[PDB]
Design a protein around this ligand. Structure first.
Ligand SMILES: CC(=O)N[C@@H]1[C@@H](O)[C@H](O[C@@H]2O[C@H](CO)[C@@H](O)[C@H](O)[C@H]2NC(C)=O)[C@@H](CO)O[C@H]1O
Ligand SMILES: CC(=O)N[C@@H]1[C@@H](O)[C@H](O[C@@H]2O[C@H](CO)[C@@H](O)[C@H](O)[C@H]2NC(C)=O)[C@@H](CO)O[C@H]1O
Lengths: 171, 171
């Protein structure tokens, strides 16, 4: 229910602004001074100009590094987010990973959904669920995901904690 | 710090999935069945195929009524989300509002950022707080937002509750 620093990076639906006090709504109250994410009145900084401050809410990052949507944003120079250009990745990149847990298709391109996350997926939120660990040649996960005690990649206590074989374990 | 139903329609950062228990992670335990938003293994339907629904986390809704990212979702047919084609709106498009609280620029195109939200903005999260209520001719906000006591539009208990001049006022 809470957002931003107060809600654990949590985001408001439909681009509602996360006021400085971790709540959701529209208006100067939530969108003005303070705003942590959502349709903030002052567009955030990102990537090049911000060292990789990727845009939250799956917003596009412009060539100047401000978060938003629109041709100006998602169009050319788009440094991140749902850009209109095709974002490559994978073996064909020298092994490169998609941003914001995006799946890298067999074809070497970022996206979300069956075609991207399904069979052949190279990194990101791949739904193939390939097992890792001791019982799998010692396969490690991509994106530094936690290889759970049951040889499964994920992120969370169930994965990163008790018996986390590899990745971002909590021990 | 709860998502989905367990957290007031909240979404997780970086495309992490919201399990059936209201928590954020990556893995069949967050992304598998139960997943409420985020990079769900079984994409959420949307658009005409799904009664006009919008995609969580600002995902494109492909022409087939499935949410995701990449050419197939954001390219052609894209019935919603950060569509690759400039979304049209306003006095130009028959008063058509931008979906997911996007700002309809004066040039009739949905986006987020100074260019769309700033001066001219026709609807959505416009950073211009044009006065509403008796405070200024009895003006009414766009998107069914609540005009508060002060004569300023927005969403929250502070705009929709006590002294809300018009809009989706609570009371
Ligand atoms: C110093 C300056 O204003 N440089 C301009 C860029 O910042 C500007 O990008 C836009 O900057 C605005 C801040 O003044 C942002 O609100 C806005 O979101 C951002 N727009 C984009 C698409 O990144 C560019 C382009 O208008 O011009 C420079 O001169
Ligand atoms: C009516 C129908 O079945 N049309 C087919 C589409 O469903 C199908 O699109 C893909 O469907 C998959 C599940 O059946 C989804 O995983 C996938 O996201 C979806 N693709 C898009 C872009 O939404 C396509 C094949 O991709 O064929 C149609 O005939």
């Amino acid at each position: 229910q809470r957002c931003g620093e107060q809600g654990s990076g949590m985001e408001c639906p439909n681009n509602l602004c996360c006021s400085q006090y971790g709540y959701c709504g529209m208006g100067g109250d939530y969108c003005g001074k303070g705003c942590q994410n959502g349709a903030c009145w002052t567009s955030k900084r990102c990537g090049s100009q911000a060292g990789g401050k990727t845009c939250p809410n799956n917003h596009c990052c412009s060539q100047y590094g401000h978060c938003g949507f629109g041709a100006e944003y998602c169009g050319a120079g788009c440094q991140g987010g749902p850009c209109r250009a095709d974002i490559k990745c994978g073996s064909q990149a020298g092994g490169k990973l998609c941003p914001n847990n995006l799946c890298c298709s067999q074809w070497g391109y970022c996206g979300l959904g069956s075609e991207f996350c399904g069979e052949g997926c190279q990194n990101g939120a791949c739904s193939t669920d390939k097992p890792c660990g001791k019982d799998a040649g010692g396969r490690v996960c991509t994106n530094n995901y936690c290889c759970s005690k049951w040889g499964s990649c994920g992120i969370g206590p169930g994965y990163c904690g008790a018996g986390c074989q590899s990745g971002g374990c909590d021990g």
